[PDB]
Amino acid sequence: RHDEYQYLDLIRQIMRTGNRKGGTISMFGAQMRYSLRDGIFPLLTTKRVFWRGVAEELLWFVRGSTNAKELQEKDIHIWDEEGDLGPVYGFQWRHFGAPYADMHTDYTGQGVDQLQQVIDTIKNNPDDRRIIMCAWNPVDVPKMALPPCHCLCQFYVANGELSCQLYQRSADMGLGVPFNIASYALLTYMIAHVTDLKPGDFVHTLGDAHVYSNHCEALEEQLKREPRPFPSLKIKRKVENISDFKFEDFELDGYKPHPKIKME
Amino acid sequence: MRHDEYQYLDLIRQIMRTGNRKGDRTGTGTISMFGAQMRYSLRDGIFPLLTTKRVFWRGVAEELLWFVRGSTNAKELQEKDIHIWDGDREEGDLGPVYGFQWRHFGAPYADMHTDYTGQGVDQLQQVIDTIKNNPDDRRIIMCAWNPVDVPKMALPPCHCLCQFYVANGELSCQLYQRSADMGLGVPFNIASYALLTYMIAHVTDLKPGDFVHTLGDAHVYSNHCEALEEQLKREPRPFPSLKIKRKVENISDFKFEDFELDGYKPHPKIKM
Known part of the structure; x- marks a missing residue:
């Protein structure tokens, strides 16, 4: 059974038994x-996802950037002194x-480079149960423009496979969740590549999972759509360091989604 | 619908049958x-204290009261005959742990x-305030995973973060556990955070809802497999009930004697 049915079954479950809030x-x-x-990339197919936005935003995080103008430069308006977001994800x-x-x-050389630490741990001690990258900083959260939805992620290594689990405190099933799946599925592919491992699974854990009431008629329309086979993802060249990836290094083959749906 | 302990039982079974061997x-x-x-x-007063193996209730409750106090002193637990934290500073000093x-x-x-x-962020008092003033908030988080402090701790925290949720006058809690020993660890961990939820619900005038237990590396120790196979042959019994005997104003004001655990009828303890 297609992995995307987990996402739809949850929207269906929320709209039918979920708790209404104002x-x-x-x-x-x-x-x-x-x-x-096997190169499978979970880019959701019942609605078109902004792939370029997903990839460029992640490369921006990897760079360490806290400047929204660096994304605006790439005609990415997801994060719209001026441009200064405070100590966010990157x-x-x-x-x-x-x-x-x-x-x-x-x-x-300031602070803990968690990204490089997780990569070093995967290579030197793959059996380690502390391979965590945490963006939830109780000290820095009031200094941030928006508090992080993606609290932490853990990685796991078994049978030459790299797995990743994301803890998401707040999840919009409409617009949010498909983009979030792709971001962390791409991060896994990147870390797998630089650590000479194969990507395994992406485990998406949600805290407050919700649908907006004004998006329900559109979600009812989306629930009627049959998921299509997921695209494939290839990294075109050998990338030595995680900071060395470029958008052009990614090869997304066979992405054939259903049309985009307006969710205001 | 079906006994909640069957989730824990089915996972041990699944790990021992299809899991990955390490070390x-x-x-x-x-x-x-x-x-x-x-x-x-x-x-309805249900307390998820696992029944296929007796769980150390006094250890659960005393350890949590010690975390709430903000203590990092293992001697304070030893004093109460709790030796869970026994296994270049002073003896009993565990470093910047949970408390x-x-x-x-x-x-x-x-x-x-x-x-x-007055030093650092009081996340426990912050979750209390947020539940009271803005229950619909999706940032009701208490994080013990500190990348800065993790190298200076005796043991890195297994219980990374927990989030709180309020709906229909009910307080729910979700714990992210990075490392979960299915044998001895996990039942103690369920009870610890279900008890925390009961305490926070009490001081915030809410009713306990659900305890959601999320696991990262879920594992059984190879030397505990014989004992776990014997435990899998056991049928879960109805969970006990929990009541808080008196009205407790602040989270720091709870005592072991304030808790009333009624009808805990587990199967015997198993050596692991």
Whole structure:
């Protein structure tokens, strides 16, 4: 059975048994597993996902950037001094615990580079149960433009496979969740590549999983759609370091989704 | 619908049958799987204290009261005949563990005798305030996973984060556990966070809802497999009930004697 049915079964479950709040219908605690094996990329097909946005945003995080203008430059308006987002994902991943000044500050060697630490642990001690990258910083969350939805991610190694689990505190089943699946499925592919492992699974754990009430008629239309086979993902060239990836290095073959649906 | 303990039982079974073997099968070795989720109802006084093996209730409750106090002193537990934390600072000093991260996240750690009052982020009192003032908030998080403090701890925390949720006058909790020993660990962990939810529900005038247990590396120790096979032959019994005997104003004001665990009828303990 197609992995995308876990996502639809949850929307269906939320709209039918979920808790209405004042405007969302929500449930607490969910878990999906997406296979990343044999080049399979879980880019959801019942609605078109902004692939370029997914990839460019992740490359921006990997760079350590806290400057929204660097994304606006790539005609990505998902994150719209001016452009200064505070110590968000890119800063937490590369410089956890460092004092935040501004987006122009050179933070090289400041704080914990969790991304490089997780990569080193996968190579030197793959059986380690502490391969975690945490963006949820209780000290820095009030300094951030928006508090992180993606709290932490854990990685696991078995039979030459790299697996990743994301903890998402807040999940919009409409627009949010498909983009979130792709971001962390791409991160796994990138870390797998630099650590000489094959991608395994992407485990998506949700806290407050919800649908917006004004999106329900559109979700009813989307629930009527049959998932199509997922596209394939290839990294065109040998990338030595995680910071060395470019959008052009990714080869997304066979992405054939159903049309986009308006969810205001 | 079907006994909640069957989620825990089915997972042990699934791990021992299809799990991945790591390390030395002579002792330290494990059989593991990655990514799991259980849901335990806490409604109508139900307390999910596992019944196929007796769980150390007094250990669960005393350890949690010690975390709430913000203590990092293992001697305070030993004093209450709790030796769960027995296995270059002073004896009993565990470093910046759970108690510290919950009450003083971000504060620099010196020793277990240092007065940290007003230092760091009090996440436990923050979750209380948010539940009371804005129950619909999706940022009701208490994080013990501190990348900065993890190298200076005796043991890195297994219980990374927990999130709280409010709907229909019910408080639910979700725990993210990075490493879960299915044998001894996991039942104690279910009880610990179900008890925390009961305490927070009490001081915030809410009713307990669900305890959602999310796992990262879910594992059984190879030397515990014989004992787990014997446990799998056991049928779960109805869960006990939990009542808080008196009205407790603040989370720091609970005592072991305040808890009333009625009808806990487990199967005998198994050596692991």
